């Protein structure tokens, strides 16, 4: 009741003409989920600039934070390794990588209200949730369209790391307001630097 | 297309504002998720403490099945660290652990039909295949509201883990089925004790 | 508000009273899921039996292609691992094996406009594409039944695996492709054969 | 005739006044030379980006060249890291980093006459010697106005390398150009992998 080398015939003939301009691989895999992902490639790309922007603000002489300055770094290389993931899965299923054009990141950090060092996490934070949702909506779109194996690649990885990502940058927060400016930023900032 | 600056204003100056007794991190995470898992940690740490009780009983001198005894505490100690994992993530999400009383076990378990052993075995079992359950509505609420990273958190942790321990229990139950009491719960006893 | 011994007695009643020939585990199980998966796993058997035939074919001693022999033996091995691995859920979820016939597969796999190298690893992909809907189709039905855990089950692991298993003979065909045959065709098999 | 207390007092006012809002470190760094620098930066930047983009392409099971693919997102994760050296330098000296765009590259690299390995390869040459220009113009401001530290820093770093790399580059075409498509291709597409 299972004969192959019929039930292949389909599969044979569309794999037997291709020409080297299609993709072999490609199968059950749609355009808007393979839009999705580039969309969701150029929203890991930006950020990590955005994270190599704050890194610069918090290298500088006078601002004295190099624990906060390779944190940022690291998350930078991060959020491009995320990018990087994305693509992976992308040419992985017979989709086709699209890279999408960088804005210019804001490079000025400075703020009386709550401090650099608060700010540039509150701002993490903010960028940190925001992309939760982005990524809640990559997945949405999967679902949408009833793709198992990229929802399941969507939430297995970046989606259930955001989660995580999300709750350490609130407890970062939470810190830099429980000890204010000055020495408080000095300590995390040296906490920020071991890590 | 791109806008990170323009696109985060909206969780930017929900995450400034925000007063020190709310959660930072929660982003699409229900009430009704969040109520569901304080339920479902009840559930674990309820059955955690029933199978503490079912260890002292097999502790008891003239019942004499250390092995099950040992056996008990253990599954004790591993429900209730399923507690935690929950409460771990209810606090990941924003969510808040609420915990609630505990009901006094039953302690007596002798049992002249079935004998103890046989018995206890398939209480367990029972609770257990209840408990799959339970992580079932468990996940159907998350399901219901959407919430992905929940799903994925729930399904690949402790429901995937639940299959597992049934099966195991089941097997349990055949084999005290098969061997009969006296030789049968001794052996099984020695058994159930270098695990 | 949670009554253990009392919510339990439904599922004790069940477990004290079943017979030795009824599954003790088996819980929110659909006889239409339980019988896909004995689908599937004839799928992978029947699949690992195409090629073992397969390997039998570049064995022989005027073909001289054993890389390609053992890179066939090697993926015959593999998916009747994955038949084992479906077997074992099965009976995991107390549903129970059932094994279907094998029909003969094709011996022979000259090919004079592609070559039998570059014609099997078309083949080979092109079940494989075929398999990864197949995969589909499977998880398509314990998402209808709304079984969470197999859901998880499939999509985490045959699944998943399938979308690399997929690309990866993509590449070996583009390969084929490439460098055509003689020089091309042997060079490939010394690949084939250290992996 | 050397009185360090008389003579530092220009510097030290300097010093002591400075607010927090300027760069303490910044001597004799000119503003021209601080906006090259941030030229050269996105430059390296846009380079990382587009090796980036021919990763993918060589990642696309049709195109199956996986060792040109690993071959380009090192040689974007070196340019990257060569727009982080920029930067660090910028901060060092006082300067300020300004990130810019980044353009959309191409994603396309067929070309039916030369190949798209050879193709690629031509391009990435031309890259390279046109970013030697580049590093060239770099050096040429910062001798402008005299900025031996700087020059020092341009010359014995990124401009030494990037002799290297483009005679490596010019190689590889050469190479490229030897063997032909097909058989060529595949061995060299070995070569790039092991690297
Ligand atoms: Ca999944
Ligand atoms: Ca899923
Ligand atoms: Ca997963
Ligand atoms: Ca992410
Ligand atoms: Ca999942
Ligand atoms: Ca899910
Ligand atoms: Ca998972
Ligand atoms: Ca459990
Ligand atoms: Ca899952
Ligand atoms: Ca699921
Ligand atoms: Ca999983
Ligand atoms: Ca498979
Ligand atoms: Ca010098
Ligand atoms: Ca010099
Ligand atoms: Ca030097
Ligand atoms: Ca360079």
Do not use: W
Not at 7 to 23: F, I, K, M
Not at 125 to 134: A, D, I, R, V
Not at 162 to 189: N, T
């Amino acid at each position: 009741v299972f004969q192959p080398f019929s039930e292949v015939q389909g599969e044979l003939s569309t794999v037997t003409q291709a020409p080297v301009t299609d993709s072999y691989a490609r199968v059950e895999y749609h355009i808007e989920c393979e839009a999705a992902i580039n969309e969701q490639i150029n929203i890991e790309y930006t950020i990590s600039y955005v994270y190599h922007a704050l890194h610069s603000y918090f290298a500088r002489d006078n601002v004295g934070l190099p624990g906060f300055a390779k944190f940022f770094k690291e998350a930078s290389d991060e959020e491009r390794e995320h990018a990087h993931m994305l693509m992976d899965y992308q040419t992985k299923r017979g989709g086709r990588v699209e890279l999408k054009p960088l804005a210019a990141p804001e490079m000025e950090f400075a703020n009386d209200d709550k401090g650099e060092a608060l700010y540039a996490m509150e701002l993490a934070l903010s960028l940190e949730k925001l992309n939760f949702q982005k990524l809640q909506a990559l997945q949405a779109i999967a679902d949408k369209h009833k793709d198992a194996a990229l929802c399941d690649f969507v939430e297995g990885g970046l989606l259930s790391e955001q989660v995580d990502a999300v709750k350490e940058h609130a407890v970062y927060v939470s810190q830099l307001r429980r000890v204010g400016k000055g020495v408080g930023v000095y300590l995390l900032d040296q906490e920020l630097g071991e890590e």
